[PDB]
Amino acid sequence: TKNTQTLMPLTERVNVQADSARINQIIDGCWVAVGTNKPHAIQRDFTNLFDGKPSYRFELKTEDNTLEGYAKGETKGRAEFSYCYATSDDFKGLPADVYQKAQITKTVYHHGKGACPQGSSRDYEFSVYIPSSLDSNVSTIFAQWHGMPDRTLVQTPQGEVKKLTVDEFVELEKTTFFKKNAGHEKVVRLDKQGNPMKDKNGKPVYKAGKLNGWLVEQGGYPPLAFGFSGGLFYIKANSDRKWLTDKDDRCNANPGKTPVMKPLTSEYKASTIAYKLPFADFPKDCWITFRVHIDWTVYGKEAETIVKPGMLDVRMDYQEQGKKVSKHIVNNEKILIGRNDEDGYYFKFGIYRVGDSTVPVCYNLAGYSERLE
Template sequence: MKKSVLWATAGCFLLCSVTVTKGQEQGKEPLTPRVNIQSDTAAKSDIIDKQWVGVGINRPYAIQRDYSLPFQGKPSYRFELKGEDNTLEGYARGTTKGRAELSYCYATSDDFKGLPASDYEHAGKMKTVYHHGKGISPQGASMSYTFSVFIPSSLPKDVSAIFAQWHGMPSRRLVSTPEGEVKMLSADEFLSMYDRMIFKKNIAYDKIAKKDRNGEVTYKTGKPNGWLIEQGGYPPLAFGFSNGYFYIKANSDKKWLTDKTDRCNANPAKTPVMKPVTSRYKASTIVYKEPFAEFPKDQWITFDIDIDWTVYGKEANTVVKPGRINIGMIYTDKGKEITRQLADNAEILIGRNDEDGYYFKFGIYRVGNSTVPVIYNLAGYKETPR
């Protein structure tokens, strides 16, 4: 809508007509486009502020550009999940989880220019479309990241949600045969499997064709056939709230093909800081934690993170070089800037034994079957190689 605004400049006054959106006028603007980054490219209309795409539930309140709570002169992003907004199956049987996030990694049609037309279709089947895009930190890279969060004092203390995470980029071409041989298939070999099987998470099932009354061929899921495919696992780094704590957790998996039955995962309430919980191939470390009540509220908190991602040995299932992590936390207390060192260039296992690296998402990833309503704001993300 058009509005007249009086501007003062160089000692005189100008009456200007400017465009003010409804969202700006009301303080918040819904951001409803969503992209399945693994299977689809992002259209121009899907891209938010030239760097994000939305993932998860797309109700108007779930992700909004928030003009009423700016960060460094720009609108922040407001995220909200209500009690009924868990739409995903949880890690444990019978549990649920909910998601409303912005992903820094995605691909566009431009990323497939010059490639055979079939490459995009095949990438969709292999769920590697986003591997062709922006926002990827390679395995073993040295990176710096920063972002800021505004946690309102109204957020319930029993919230269970991740507000920022770095995720792995698994390849479904990495498989285990019915005989237990782990190998990386060619694209053609995987696509042949895709035509014959149905994949649910990491398990392959026989694909059974049947005809309906109209003669149309449909497919149903048969029995598990012994094949397993790589699906990924816990995020290599996550910032969140759980069990009455704010926590930062680092995960590592040196097994080339992830063992989904291995649930090695540190509990923020029970695990001491920098004392990793380990299994044969995995390590899960609480890098930092503090009681939820002590986490600063109703103000912007900035995190500065330096990471040397762990280097892994692919099919050897080894750690070639451990990683390191450094985390600073900056906020204001009674008008004074406070800087806290949450991790001091500590050696750590952090990452996954994938061919590709990691990408950043922030927002709400509500876990542990929680339905506690969640609202907070995030802003100011940047990443740079070191």
């Protein structure tokens, strides 16, 4: 379209769990970006409009994996937009310690917009443009509905699972250094001279000592993901009914080896490939609109039961040879989808390169909207 401005880098990034987003960090009034801040990673695209608005071009080159994988030596890349985040306005008028404690418990976004409640019914819609230049063997998730773990739910060194209050978790953090989900003894960093280090505020610099037996809920597979892997486009739903998620339970369906709508299961998890299609058959160089309806599974909290299964419906619309096409790729399928958490789920789209892959990824996304139903 316009050449006065074509590709405009959007380099501001926000850690939604630990920080509120500043005004100059919010994109188009409804997104914040997460991941590598390389200029070419995320750019507003005036050359490819969707709904009369510039779209978002995401790109991860072969050397853009800035994160570590689940296994030693492995890595992963990320450049996404998150619909859920808190702003300073969300904490305006409250005592300063509310925000301070939210940062410590990693629940800042609990005070922001963008998340749906547990067991709710929601409609989502978004569009993606996959250029013919995208390698068929990329391993990337381009849209996902992410969980919001119980940040104060822990397991004592004796094995008991307890939901602490914000204040109690804050107290625990005074003596426990949590590396993701595992708790370690908090050790005071010392320099070569043997003198204790000091952060910007003059406080000691802590480091992780040995494991101290404490665990906190963190991580977990995304309840719903749209992506490419092994030469296939797929839609995968995950369910975790355990009250305190077990990261060691690797129940995760392989798009190519798992039959459609037949969940792979463990005691507490269920992973379902709701739909799969050879990459070559995925429409290229055109905007594809996905209409997704989700009835989130209702869980029993401490009871760890499935109170009510969920449901997933997906429609895929695009223009072919000059005519409107709409495929009902996931037809009102009863399914287990979600996590047994207090909080619900939030949407993200862009690039999440997984499977220890470094294959270049580049495509455009746009037109997100969510409604109640």
